Structure formats: structure tokens, C-alpha cells
Ligand binder design. Structure first.
Ligand code: SF4
Ligand code: SF4
Lengths: 114, 376, 176, 71, 90, 57, 111, 45, 208
């Protein structure tokens, strides 16, 4: 498709990029974990980062892989600074929300027709 | 406390004293408007224009009701408009009673507030007697004024106006040449440039700065043409010459309210053609044709032809837009509102670099930034 | 047209410049107003002494709701489902179902009193002229379980004063 | 099951009922063919609607009005 | 008296325009029944819809679009300046 | 100018959540409510999704 | 005059030859563009007719009318920049024919 | 009611004791006025 | 017709035919359509290439000033196959007129910032990145305005169900204010207002 790409060209400089800002996240999880005075096992903070970057795996295209970045490149602005107050962060790890069954026969006794 | 009846959070990196940096975060009041006005009809969705700002009430809706009558090719009848000057130019006595005071409550004084709001009350009756409610009152419509005003008000407007130029002389001896105030504001936050235009600012922080233009006499509204007034102007671009417009702009209004009580001709109020106005309660209640245009007019709306407009007015603190697409049928399509607060606060970061921190509290007050409006 | 404000020049002569050096250094201004324009306290205060005295209003005022009934009562509402359909906020909720004789009336009628934005759009769409915004600011109870209204809260709240209401409309109905 | 909410709260309900309060009316008569039903006083009440009473004995009270009406 | 002109020793003098209007010189009530007239082509035997026509007006007129001694025509004449508007313009 | 022709079937991902693959939309011409004869409610091909449970509160 | 009027400017100084530099400066540079696109046929045509009024009458005051700018000192800044486009105008190439008509049904409003 | 020598503080009221199942005096709210005076005390007419 | 019908004025409609005739004359590399709104306003349909270019011509000239940028906005239309839209809106202080500049786009195709031309598109471009998702390159800054820090949906486009996907509520089980999926107390009734018969003959869509 003819439209100018954003940053990358095909898939390599692109997949050099996603490798890159990983470390900015990987090098800085914990400085926050003492800064907000939020308490968690610092390794959790390194599981989620690696839990997300493995999530969107099937992407076939440039200008998508550049699009996601422009989001991801942002967040390091807010989080590495303090523009969030504890409660824009911890929302990643959902503490309160009761589990979903996701199995079959556990559904059939609770809830209609999902 | 210095929120000016609003909730902003601004962040500055100051250099040891001087600010030299500011980058505010708006978006605390967003509420999700223009996504919700594609989903409502034309007469049903009116108030969400009245609730936009808190201070000017009938001056909003004067800027919507004029952006619809266009697409309909219809004008109000003569006694319509000459209301919309009397209320339209009476709420310029509101935002200029507020922005001289609840600005100068930050400068720390007490009385110029507790001294005035004795009076800003005597006005709020006149919203209640005319139609219903304390502040937000939905009165103007696409067809000119809703319903006529009682027997009265013209001995309560006259009786009240001839008392008023004194009150505005208790905000003068108490302010202008009082030194501790003159020194809190002169040569403070001066934007004299042709950036003060390049940003596209609206009225005051224009007209008080030199460059000379106003949308009341360069464009007509609704008979605004037939009354005479002079647009005060400032010398140097600082704040204390954006204050001095807002006194000599409260002493112009009492000319028009005094000039507009003499002329109001008898006549109907609603637009006559009745497809866009409902009928009375004598007519819808006997003849036949007066339901099918009162009972299809309270479910779907008018039918307002397709095609896009724009429009503008002079609202007490600056312009007000409506960019109203319409798709050719009853519910609208984008209704995009612009009010200042995307200019007058686009230009803080610029304006203030090189003065202290205890100025930046008293810079804001002169733009008259009032939020929930930046729902723009 | 125009005007020019703050465009002036000092005179620069020794008859003047004393008058501006008898000002800075002797404070001949700045005691002019706030030595005086402040006092000027000798005016009668303006206060509406509240628990007893009360302030003005007008016959077109808006407020707590009601449902009238004619002389011997019909529950004037016919459930034509309008005051429901012009409502911007969508407070109103109506469920009709044919009453025993065969004249239609309501069953559930609920004005939420939090959502209602006080238009004056539900006073002005009712053709049989039932539902009417009362002029009493009686309100403020302590539980949000409450302000939601049912039908049979309204009627009383609108038969508690009909000497208030039935004498306003006959001032106001000649205009609209 | 549901009934435990108004316990001690005294349960506002409507002392009068209009389910039928109508039948106590002295059902009128005219001596003519068709009539004008505008009720409750001029310009407060249902829109004017004309009904025909010719049956034998019945009437018709228009259904806005409810008030038992006939010849 | 001794407190009457000591209110008049400052701010000039007023004694006519006074903040509280509380005393007389107001409007009383709505005594009269009014009658609001309906003028604007409200009558019969002539007024005919399709001459009064508020709506039903055409689509935006096009101009040359895809598929000469010009004076450099400006959208309109330029603005002439304003007066200085004798009031006390300085 | 960087024209750089290529072909990749356009798709977009991540903005909604699980409602990408769960549902089936539908594209249909509205049928004209038959209680009236007005033929102008036709003429635009809309789309509308599957309906899931509404319960009672 | 001592007041520049519209504030942000300052009066310096020379009238009647300060323009004549720039129009002449416009006319020469402007010619380097190919002669087909009307841009020269217009961008120049306003300048010559403009310059005819310049030469010559006093005071600067009566140079104001018939040449509609703002005040003279501003008319320079009117004539200042009209260059700064021209000497770009060769960078990107307007005169060339049209490129990429939209996909043949796009601007049709009632959907 | 005063002599018509004031505006807005000219019309006033007095509460006394135990209207309807009520605490005695020093409890005074202002929803007590009979639903007639809303056509008088409020200066609506 | 006169009494209730808005009286028209012709003069304004003759010139804005001319002055807009020839800005399809001198920049044909870009402008692909132009027309005159029956109310005397102009709409210039421009390819997405010229944005910085065309304005810059509109930025300065002696025949068209257009210094004052008033309103940038957007519209998002499905079944236009290139979703969104821009509309610039510019006032020329000397000549008293409004001329609007329409430029289409998609989500993926970038558009180039107008920021060096006017410094008042600084905010109006930060916003749109939040709402619709259009991505403006080479912008001195790109961030999040008007919206919270959590909205990953870009609301005002036509796929966001009005109530967003997460209501908020505070619970004391710990000490935060946390976010649970949206559960309403009333359906948000959907009424249906669109009446038949096609009351407008002039706009009559093609016969087909
Ligand atoms: S009052 Fe008018 S609107 Fe409200 S229900 Fe009875 S009839 Fe329908
Ligand atoms: S009062 Fe205002 S809000 Fe409540 S229903 Fe009537 S109109 Fe809708």
C-alpha cells in the first residue's frame, strides 16, 4: 500500500525499535516502585513489562508496529516522571476483580449465554 | 484555592525564583460533550449549551440560536431581537462583575467581593421572573424568545439601572489609583506583539492591547445596528490596561439597556410559520392542525436542510463559535464548539516567562479563564 | 469607530511636577479613596434575615413537582407519553395500562430528582396540562435512596399546596 | 424474598384509588345527538372531542375524560 | 445631622442613587391581564403556504471542479479605517 | 517522496478488546415499517450487531 | 510619526525608497520562475500597479490611500514576506498538473 | 408586615411552637409556613 | 416570501465565486475541488499532500492575507473508505472573509503538522491525537489533552459506545480508587425519531 510509513521501513528497524524501548522499561521498573511508595515484589514489575511486549505478536505490518510504539514511547514520559498518582499505575495489576471462569461448565451455572 | 471556580493542575519548572517554564494540564472537566450531541435532537439538546459556562447564560444560545436560524432561512419577529439585546447586553454585566472581582479575590482583598454580590443578586431575580430558574435558564430557542415576559420588569429594569452606576463607582475609588493594587498590576504579562494576533486571540487581550476590532459593529447580530456605543481601547499591552477595559465596558452597557428600553415595539415573539414554532396552548387545544405540528414537533425535530455553517459572537470574555454540520435530517452531526480557553490559555506559557511565581497567579485572572468551557 | 485610552503625556512644567511630587511623597492620593471610599460604612446593611424573612420570586419560577387533578379528582395525567419524550435528561419514566373502566391512566411514574436538570420542557409539552413545576424549594433529605419519586409521592406533594399552584397559572397563562 | 426492603419503613402507598372512583358521578344527559366534551374548564383539560350517543342507553365519555356521560 | 454629610464627605455625594433600592420607587405586581397580538401573516383568504416558505432551498451552488485579465480580484474591497469618534477619545 | 509501493491487506488491532473475534456484525437494508407507506426510510446499507442478554435490574 | 500605531512595530525610517527596494527586488527574483503558471502573471501584476502609485507623491500620508495596506510602516511587512514565499515557490512545484484525484466518490455529502 | 418602607426585608414571619409532632421552639427550619403564604411571604404576589 | 424568510444578498456571492475561481488556477498540483456554500462561504477540497504548502500561499500574499487561524476541527465518516476529515478555518483580516480548507486522511497515513505555519495549531493538534487517532508527525510535542490517563479507546469516533468501557468506584478494602466494568442503573433508552417520506426534494439522492 502506498502511503508514507511513519518511522520504520520494513520490520527490522521496526523490530530493532521494540527491542529498544524494552530496556527503558526494563531498566526502569523499580525506581518508581520505591518512588510512589507502592509495595510489590520488584520482579512482578519485570513480569508485566515482559507480559505485555509478548502480547501483540501476530502483527504483520509496518506502520502498525510503528503505531503501537508511539503509544509505548509516550508512557515512559508519564511514568518515569510523576504524572500519575499510584492509582493510574496499579490499575495494570487488577487486584479487586473477581475471576472469570473461562472454562465451560463453570459458566453454565452462572450467567446467560456468553 | 486559586482555581477560579475550576480545577486545573499546572506544573512549572522554575529557575530558583523565576518561572521561565509552565505547561498546564487541562482536561479535568471534559464530561464528554460533542460525542453526546450527535445523539439528541435540536430542541432537546439545547441546554447542554447553557451549562457549558457558568456565568454568561443568555449569551450562549444567542450563539446557537443564531447558528440554526441560518440553516433554516428564517428570522425572528421584531420583538424577539429587542429582547435578545436587553438580556444579551445585561449578562455582559455579569462576567464583568465577576472578572474584576473573583479575579481580585486572588490579590487578597475582601470587600470588592462581599460588596458586589449583594448586587449580582438583584439581577438573578430577572432571570427568575422572566422564565424559571436560578442560573441556567433555557429561554432563547431557534425561534426567538420562548414566551413573553410578565407585566412588570420595565419598572424593575429602569428602577434598577439608574441606581447602578454608583456601585461601579465603589469598585473604582477602591481600586484604580489605590497604589498597592497599581503596583500589583502594571507592565505585567505584556504581550504587545503581532503574536497576540497570530495566536488568534478573541476580544479583550486585543482591544485592550491596541489592534482594533470587534464583532458587534463589524458584523450585525440581531438588531444591534440601531444603537450607538463606543468600544473602549487600551494603551499598553499589560494587564492593568486589560482591567481598564472592563470598567469602561461596564459603563457602556448601561447606555444600551437605557437606550433599549425606549424602542421595544409590540409584536409577536415566536417565529410565525409554526412548523418551527410550537403553537400556543389556546391553539393546540381546539383546532386540528395544531396537534400534528405540536405532536410531531415534540418527538422528532425540525427538518433542517443539510450543509455546513459556522458562526460567531462576542461573548463577554471573547468570541464563541459553533461549527454546525447537519446531515439533512433531524439529529445533527458534529456540533463543534470553540470558546476562548484554547487561546487565552494557549498563551500563558509564552506570556509569563521572566516574571516571578507570585505573578502567575495574577496573570491568569485577566484572561478570564473559566473551565468546563475548555470542553471545547 | 475608535477611542484611545492610556494615551497621554505628562505636562513637564514646575507648576505640575510639584503636583506629582506632592503625591508620591505626601500620599495625597491613596488616602483619597481608601481613606474614604471605604468609609462610607454608614449605609444600612443589606441582609435578608433568613430563617424568617425571605426574598423575591416570580410566578414563572421552577422547582418541586406536582400532579394536579380537576375538581373531583381525575388524576389529570392521561399518560400520553410526552413529558417523557421531550425530557433532555431522561429522568421521567412512565408505564400506562388500561384502567378498569377503560379510561387509561398510569401505573409507574417516576421523576428522578437528581437527573432532572430543571428545563421547563416538561411543563410545556403536556397538552392536557397536568404536570407542573411547583414553586416550593422544600428539599434536602439525607439519603439518596429517597429523592427518586414514585407516583404516589408526587400527587400528595402536589395536593399539599394547590392554593399555591392554582393561583400562579392564572397569572401566567395569558402570555404563552 | 423481595419483601425485606421496606421493613420498618412504613411503605408509602396511595390511600385513595381512581381504579374506579368514577362510577359515583351523576352520569349526565343532554337530549341531543352529539356533544362537546372539553372538560375540567375551558383550556385546562382534554382537547375538545365530540362523541355520539345514539345506542339506546350508554353514552361515551371520550376516554380522556372518564366521567360517565350519556343521555 | 452630623452623620448625614459625613457620608457626603467622601465619594462626591449621592443621596439619590442608593445601593439598596429598599425604599419605594419600584414596580408593584402584574395587575393587568395582557393580550399578546398575533400579526405576521396570521389571517386567512390570502396567506397561503408555498409562498411563505422558510425552508426547501437549494444545494450549495458548485464552481468549476475536476472531472484571464484578472485584476487579482480580492474576496472583497479592503477595509477603510475607523474614525477617532469624538466622545472624549483621549 | 518515498512512495514505496506494497500490498498488505489492511487490518488494525488493539483498540477494542475481545469484541474483535467474539461477535458477528450484519449488513442489511432496512425493511420499511409497514404500518405506513413512506418509501424513504430505505436506501442506505447500515450495519448492526448481534444482541446479547438484557436482564432485569 | 512617533506612534507606529498597531503596536509591536517601530518607525524606522525611510519611506518612498524603502518600498521601491523591495518591489524592484520582487520583480527581478520573480522572473526566474518559468513562464507558464499564472503565478508571475499575478504576483507581479499587483506589484507594478502598486509601484505606479508609489512614484511619486508626498506626504507619506497621501501615499496611504489608493494603496490599501495598513499604515505605511506596515505595508513594508506586507511587501516583506510576499518574497519569502516566492523564493520557496521554486522548491515545491505548484505549476505542475494535478496528482491523485480522490477515489472517485468521496465528496458527496448526504452520505 | 412592615410599613412598605423596605424591599425584601419588609415582609417577615414569626414561628411559635410545636406545629405538627414537633420539637418545641429553638428548632426552626422554614418549611413550616402554610401552603398559602408562598403566594405572599415570598413576594411572588 | 419576505416577512419570515431570511432575505438574501447577492454581492457577497459574486466575488467569492471569482476570488475562489483562481485558487484552482495557480495551485493545480494540489487543489482538487472548490465550491460556494449558498450562504457565501467557500470550501476548498485539497489533496492531503498540500497542507503546509497551500496555507503558506494563504499565509501571505497581497491578494489573500488569511493570517488569523480560527478553528481546526475534524469529522469522522464511516463508508467514506478514508475515514476521517480535517477542516481548517481561516479569517483574512483585511478582506473580511472566511475560507475553509478540507483535507481527507486515514488513521494509518500520517498528515504533516501545520505548526511552523501558524503557532496556534499547537494545541488543536495535540487534542485530535487523543480523540480520533490521527497521528501528526514532526510536531514539537505530542501528548494527552482533554482525556484521562487511562482511555485507550480514542472516544469521539463512531465506535465508542457512549458510556465508556470502565466505570469507576472506590472501595476501602485497601486504599485506592479502582476500576470495575461498567454496570448501569438504567438502560439509556434508545428512542427512534427518523420519520419517512423524504420531505426534501432538492437534495434528492441520485435515482439509481
Ligand atoms: S402530563 Fe402530559 S405528558 Fe406527563 S403524562 Fe400526563 S399527558 Fe403525558
Ligand atoms: S424537569 Fe426538566 S428535566 Fe426533569 S423532566 Fe421535566 S424537563 Fe426533563
Amino acid at each position: 500500500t502506498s502511503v508514507k510509513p511513519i518511522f520504520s521501513r520494513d520490520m527490522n528497524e521496526a523490530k530493532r525499535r521494540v527491542r529498544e524501548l524494552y530496556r527503558a522499561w526494563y531498566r526502569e521498573v523499580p525506581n518508581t516502585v520505591h518512588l510512589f511508595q507502592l509495595d510489590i515484589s520488584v520482579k512482578q514489575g519485570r513480569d508485566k513489562v515482559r507480559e505485555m511486549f509478548k502480547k501483540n505478536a501476530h502483527i504483520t505490518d509496518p506502520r502498525v508496529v510503528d503505531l503501537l510504539v508511539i503509544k509505548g514511547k509516550m508512557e515512559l514520559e508519564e511514568t518515569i516522571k510523576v504524572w500519575k498518582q499510584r492509582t493510574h499505575v496499579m490499575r495494570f495489576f487488577h487486584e479487586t476483580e473477581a475471576p472469570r471462569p473461562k472454562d465451560f461448565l463453570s459458566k453454565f451455572y452462572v450467567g446467560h449465554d456468553p | 484555592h486559586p482555581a477560579a471556580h475550576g480545577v486545573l493542575r499546572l506544573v512549572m519548572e522554575l529557575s530558583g525564583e523565576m518561572v521561565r517554564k509552565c505547561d498546564p494540564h487541562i482536561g479535568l472537566l471534559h464530561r464528554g460533550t460533542e460525542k453526546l450531541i450527535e445523539y439528541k435532537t435540536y430542541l432537546q439538546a439545547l441546554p447542554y449549551f447553557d451549562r457549558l459556562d457558568y456565568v454568561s447564560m443568555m449569551c450562549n444560545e444567542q450563539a446557537y440560536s443564531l447558528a440554526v436560524e441560518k440553516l433554516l432561512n428564517i428570522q425572528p419577529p421584531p420583538r424577539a431581537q429587542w429582547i435578545r439585546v436587553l438580556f444579551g447586553e445585561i449578562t455582559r454585566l455579569l462576567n464583568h462583575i465577576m472578572a474584576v472581582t473573583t479575579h481580585a479575590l486572588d490579590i487578597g482583598a475582601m470587600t470588592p467581593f462581599f460588596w458586589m454580590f449583594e448586587e449580582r443578586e438583584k439581577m438573578f431575580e430577572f432571570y427568575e421572573r422572566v422564565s424559571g430558574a436560578r442560573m441556567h435558564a433555557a429561554y432563547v430557542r431557534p425561534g426567538g424568545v420562548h414566551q413573553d415576559l410578565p407585566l412588570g420588569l420595565m419598572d424593575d429594569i429602569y428602577e434598577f439601572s439608574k441606581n447602578f452606576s454608583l456601585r461601579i463607582d465603589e469598585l473604582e475609588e477602591m481600586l484604580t489609583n489605590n497604589r498597592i493594587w497599581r503596583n500589583r498590576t502594571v507592565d505585567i504579562g505584556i504581550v504587545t506583539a503581532e503574536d497576540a494576533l497570530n495566536y488568534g486571540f478573541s476580544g479583550v487581550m486585543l482591544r485592550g492591547s491596541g489592534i482594533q476590532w470587534d464583532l458587534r459593529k463589524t458584523q450585525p447580530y440581531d438588531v444591534y445596528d440601531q444603537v450607538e456605543f463606543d468600544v473602549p481601547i487600551g494603551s499598553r499591552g499589560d494587564c492593568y490596561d486589560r482591567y481598564l477595559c472592563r470598567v469602561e465596558e461596564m459603563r457602556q452597557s448601561i447606555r444600551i439597556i437605557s437606550q433599549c428600553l425606549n424602542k421595544m415595539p409590540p409584536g409577536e415573539i415566536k417565529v410565525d410559520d409554526a412548523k418551527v414554532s410550537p403553537p400556543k396552548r389556546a391553539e393546540m387545544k381546539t383546532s386540528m392542525e395544531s396537534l400534528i405540528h405540536h405532536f410531531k414537533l415534540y418527538t422528532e425535530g425540525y427538518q433542517v436542510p443539510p450543509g455546513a455553517t459556522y458562526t460567531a459572537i462576542e461573548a463577554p470574555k471573547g468570541e464563541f463559535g459553533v461549527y454546525l454540520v447537519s446531515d439533512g435530517s433531524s439529529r445533527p452531526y458534529r456540533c463543534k464548539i470553540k470558546a476562548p480557553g484554547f487561546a487565552h490559555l494557549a498563551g500563558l506559557d509564552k506570556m509569563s516567562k521572566g516574571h516571578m511565581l507570585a505573578d502567575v497567579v495574577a496573570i491568569i485572572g485577566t484572561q478570564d479563564i473559566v473551565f468546563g468551557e475548555v470542553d471545547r | 469607530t475608535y477611542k484611545y485610552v492610556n494615551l497621554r503625556e505628562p505636562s513637564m512644567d514646575m507648576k505640575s511636577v510639584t503636583d506629582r511630587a506632592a503625591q508620591t511623597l505626601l500620599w495625597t492620593e491613596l488616602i483619597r479613596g481608601l481613606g474614604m471610599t471605604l468609609s462610607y460604612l454608614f449605609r444600612e446593611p443589606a441582609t435578608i434575615n433568613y430563617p424568617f424573612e425571605k426574598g423575591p420570586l416570580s410566578p414563572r419560577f421552577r422547582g418541586e413537582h406536582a400532579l394536579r387533578r380537576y375538581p373531583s379528582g381525575e388524576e389529570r395525567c392521561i399518560a400520553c407519553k410526552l413529558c417523557e419524550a421531550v425530557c433532555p435528561a431522561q429522568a421521567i419514566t412512565i408505564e400506562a395500562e388500561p384502567r378498569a373502566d377503560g379510561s387509561r391512566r398510569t401505573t409507574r411514574y417516576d421523576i428522578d430528582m437528581t437527573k432532572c436538570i430543571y428545563c421547563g420542557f416538561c411543563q410545556e409539552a403536556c397538552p392536557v396540562d397536568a404536570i407542573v413545576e411547583g414553586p416550593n424549594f422544600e428539599f434536602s433529605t439525607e439519603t439518596h435512596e429517597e429523592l427518586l419519586y414514585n407516583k404516589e409521592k408526587l400527587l400528595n406533594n402536589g395536593d399539599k399546596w394547590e392554593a399555591e399552584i392554582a393561583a400562579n397559572i392564572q397569572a401566567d397563562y395569558l402570555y404563552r | 424474598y423481595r419483601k425485606v426492603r421496606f421493613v420498618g419503613r412504613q411503605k408509602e402507598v396511595n390511600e385513595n384509588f381512581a381504579i374506579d372512583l368514577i362510577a359515583e358521578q351523576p352520569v349526565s344527559q343532554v337530549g341531543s345527538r352529539v356533544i362537546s366534551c372539553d372538560g375540567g374548564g375551558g383550556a385546562l383539560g382534554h382537547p375538545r372531542v365530540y362523541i355520539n350517543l345514539d345506542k339506546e342507553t350508554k353514552t361515551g365519555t371520550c376516554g380522556y375524560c372518564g366521567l360517565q356521560f350519556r343521555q | 445631622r452630623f452623620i448625614q454629610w459625613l457620608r457626603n464627605w467622601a465619594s462626591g455625594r449621592d443621596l439619590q442613587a442608593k445601593l439598596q433600592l429598599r425604599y419605594q420607587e419600584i414596580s408593584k405586581r402584574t395587575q393587568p391581564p395582557p393580550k399578546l397580538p398575533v400579526g405576521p401573516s396570521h389571517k386567512l383568504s390570502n396567506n397561503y403556504y408555498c409562498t411563505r416558505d422558510g425552508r426547501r432551498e437549494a444545494m450549495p451552488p458548485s464552481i468549476v471542479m475536476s472531472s484571464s485579465e484578472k485584476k487579482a480580484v480580492s474576496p472583497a474591497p479592503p477595509i477603510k479605517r475607523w474614525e477617532l469618534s469624538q466622545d472624549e477619545p483621549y | 517522496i518515498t512512495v514505496d509501493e506494497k500490498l498488505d491487506i489492511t487490518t488494525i488491532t488493539g483498540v477494542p478488546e475481545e469484541h474483535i473475534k467474539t461477535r458477528k456484525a450484519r449488513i442489511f437494508v432496512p425493511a420499511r415499517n409497514n404500518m405506513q407507506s413512506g418509501v424513504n426510510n430505505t436506501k442506505k446499507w447500515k450495519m448492526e450487531f448481534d444482541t446479547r442478554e438484557r436482564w432485569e435490574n | 510619526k512617533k506612534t507606529t500605531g498597531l503596536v509591536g512595530l517601530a518607525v524606522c525610517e525611510t519611506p518612498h525608497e524603502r518600498l521601491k527596494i523591495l518591489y524592484t527586488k520582487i520583480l527581478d527574483v520573480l522572473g526566474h520562475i518559468p513562464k507558464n503558471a499564472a503565478y508571475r502573471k499575478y504576483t507581479e501584476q499587483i506589484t507594478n500597479e502598486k509601484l505606479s502609485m508609489v512614484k511619486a507623491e508626498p506626504d507619506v500620508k497621501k501615499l496611504e490611500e489608493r494603496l490599501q495596506g495598513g499604515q505605511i510602516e506596515e505595508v513594508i511587512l506586507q511587501a516583506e514576506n510576499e518574497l519569502s514565499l516566492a523564493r520557496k515557490m521554486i522548491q515545491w512545484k505548484p505549476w505542475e498538473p494535478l496528482v491523485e484525484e480522490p477515489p472517485a466518490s468521496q465528496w458527496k455529502w448526504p452520505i | 408586615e412592615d410599613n412598605k418602607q423596605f424591599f425584601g426585608r419588609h415582609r417577615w414571619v414569626i414561628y411559635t411552637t410545636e406545629m405538627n409532632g414537633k420539637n418545641t421552639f429553638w428548632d426552626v427550619d422554614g418549611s413550616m409556613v402554610p401552603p398559602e403564604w408562598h403566594r405572599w411571604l415570598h413576594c411572588m404576589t | 416570501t419576505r416577512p419570515t424568510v431570511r432575505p438574501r444578498n447577492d454581492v457577497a456571492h459574486k466575488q467569492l465565486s471569482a476570488f475562489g475561481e483562481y485558487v484552482a488556477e495557480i495551485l493545480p498540483k494540489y487543489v482538487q475541488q472548490v465550491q460556494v456554500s449558498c450562504f457565501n462561504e467557500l470550501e476548498i477540497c485539497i489533496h492531503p499532500d498540500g497542507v503546509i504548502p497551500v496555507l503558506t500561499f494563504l499565509r501571505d500574499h497581497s491578494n489573500a492575507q488569511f493570517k488569523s487561524l480560527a478553528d481546526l476541527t475534524a469529522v469522522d465518516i464511516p463508508t467514506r473508505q478514508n475515514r476521517f476529515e480535517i477542516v481548517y478555518n481561516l479569517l483574512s483580516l483585511r478582506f473580511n472573509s472566511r475560507i475553509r480548507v478540507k483535507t481527507y486522511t486515514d488513521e494509518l497515513t500520517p498528515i504533516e503538522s501545520s505548526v511552523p505555519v501558524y503557532k496556534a495549531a499547537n494545541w488543536y493538534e495535540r487534542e485530535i491525537w487523543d480523540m480520533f487517532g490521527v497521528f501528526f508527525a514532526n510536531h514539537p510535542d505530542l501528548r494527552r489533552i482533554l482525556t484521562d490517563y487511562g482511555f485507550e479507546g480514542h472516544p469521539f469516533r463512531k465506535d465508542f459506545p457512549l458510556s465508556g468501557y470502565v466505570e469507576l468506584r472506590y472501595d476501602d478494602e485497601v486504599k485506592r480508587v479502582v476500576a470495575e466494568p461498567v454496570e448501569l442503573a438504567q438502560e439509556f433508552r434508545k428512542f427512534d425519531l427518523n420519520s419517512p417520506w423524504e420531505a426534501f426534494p432538492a437534495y434528492r439522492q441520485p435515482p439509481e
